[PDB]
Design a protein around this ligand. Structure first.
Ligand SMILES: Nc1ncnc2c1ncn2[C@@H]1O[C@H](COP(=O)(O)OP(=O)(O)O)[C@@H](O)[C@H]1O
Ligand SMILES: [K+]
Ligand SMILES: [Mg+2]
Length: 378
């Protein structure tokens, strides 16, 4: 029985398996090759993934996401205190450890972040088993390069809770380099830059690989810049358009905003391959249909400051690594948001036109490398 590779992501997770000699990234039951790291507790069931993220509930307190932001941290951590101010669910203190408290089937329940993450890993395990047709018990799970020992142990604990034997925890940028075979270099140092713009975080890592051995030389980024922020700019744009056209403010109706956010995320993705996207929602607010569109150009304008801001951490990483651009041998794209053409253009221009590694979908590259590593260790 195969071991799998799992990218347990801040916003989206992905699972792959090495078989027939290569990695197959596995689609979930809605046919999506990544799954939101998102749980919802309802009157009658626990929803995980797409069903949780797109649920349109009257009571927003009972969904949980961003557990990776809490994992391995103490309640009084200023990052925890800061993040709590923008989550709809309740974080409580139990012996200086944060727990999330929700109502499920009418009863109050609290969960440690490792337990929430275990539910996401359980879903990914189940996606893999549905595809393989047999049970899976072994996995490699990835984490950010900047995770410390406590965060790594907590991620392994989430794996154990989910019923997995965790063969190894590897760094996300290392996983991406392995996906592209950059581990097979030979004697002599090879410097790899990983540009990872995801749904919630932006990370730039510089790795040196020497005779198969990886060393992280520098990391930089922004833990609050990602695709969700671009979604938010689109949602705000369309809320303004609705008010302009229909003289009604929908922004305080949680159900309308949720439906709009789901439609906006789809439209954003479409703008990565097409030059315009339709946005069509029946009965969005007070019975009023909302049919409209947006061009790729307009989306780029809405997000221009955020896209440009990704270049400073690249300069920082290079400075910390004491490397010139020409000393970087391979550039690798990771993260769903690096599928945005404007983002690729900015990075390519910064690197004087050089080729970017992007043939593996960037939102899948981490799971791909994790799956290669899982096959190696089994
Ligand atoms: N084709 C696409 N174009 C633009 N953004 C995309 C595309 N596909 C996924 N995304 C965005 O990628 C982000 C998720 O990135 P991903 O790397 O899958 O997760 P994480 O950052 O949680 O590891 C989401 O904001 C999603 O909307
Ligand atoms: K991911
Ligand atoms: Mg990621």
């Amino acid at each position: 029985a195969a071991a799998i590779g799992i990218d347990l992501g801040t916003t989206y997770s992905c699972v792959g398996v090495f078989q027939h000699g290569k990695v197959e990234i596995i689609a979930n039951d809605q046919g999506n090759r990544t799954t939101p790291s998102y749980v919802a507790f309802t009157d009658t069931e626990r929803l995980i993934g797409d069903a949780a993220k797109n649920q349109v509930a009257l009571n927003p307190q009972n969904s949980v996401f961003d557990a990776k932001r809490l994992i391995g941290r103490k309640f009084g951590d200023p990052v925890v205190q800061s993040d709590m101010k923008h989550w709809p669910f309740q974080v409580i203190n139990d012996g200086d450890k944060p727990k999330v408290q929700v109502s499920y089937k009418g009863e109050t329940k609290a969960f440690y972040p490792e337990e929430i993450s275990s539910m996401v890993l359980t879903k990914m395990k189940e996606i893999a088993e549905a595809y393989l047709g047999y049970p899976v018990t072994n996995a490699v799970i990835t984490v950010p390069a900047y995770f410390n020992d406590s965060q790594r142990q907590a991620t392994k604990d989430a794996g154990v809770i989910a019923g997995l034997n965790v063969l190894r925890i590897i760094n996300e940028p290392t996983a991406a380099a392995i996906a592209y075979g950059l581990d097979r270099t030979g004697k002599g140092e090879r410097n790899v830059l990983i540009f990872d713009l995801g749904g919630g975080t932006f990370d730039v890592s510089i790795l040196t690989i020497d005779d198969g051995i990886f060393e992280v030389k520098a990391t930089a980024g922004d833990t609050h810049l990602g695709g969700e922020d671009f979604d938010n700019r689109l949602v705000n744009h369309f809320v303004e358009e609705f008010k302009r056209k229909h003289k009604k403010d929908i922004s305080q109706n949680k159900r309308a905003v949720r439906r709009l956010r789901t439609a906006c995320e789809r439209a954003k993705r479409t703008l990565s391959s097409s030059t315009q996207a339709s946005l069509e929602i029946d009965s969005l607010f007070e019975g009023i249909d909302f049919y409209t569109s947006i061009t790729r150009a307009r989306f780029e304008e809405l997000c221009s400051d955020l896209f440009r801001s990704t270049l400073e951490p690249v300069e920082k990483a290079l400075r910390d690594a004491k490397l010139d651009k020409a000393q970087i041998h391979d550039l690798v794209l990771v993260g769903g948001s690096t599928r945005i053409p404007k983002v690729q253009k900015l990075l390519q221009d910064f690197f004087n036109g050089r080729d970017l590694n992007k043939s593996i979908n960037p939102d899948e590259a981490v799971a791909y490398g994790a799956a290669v590593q899982a096959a190696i260790l089994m």
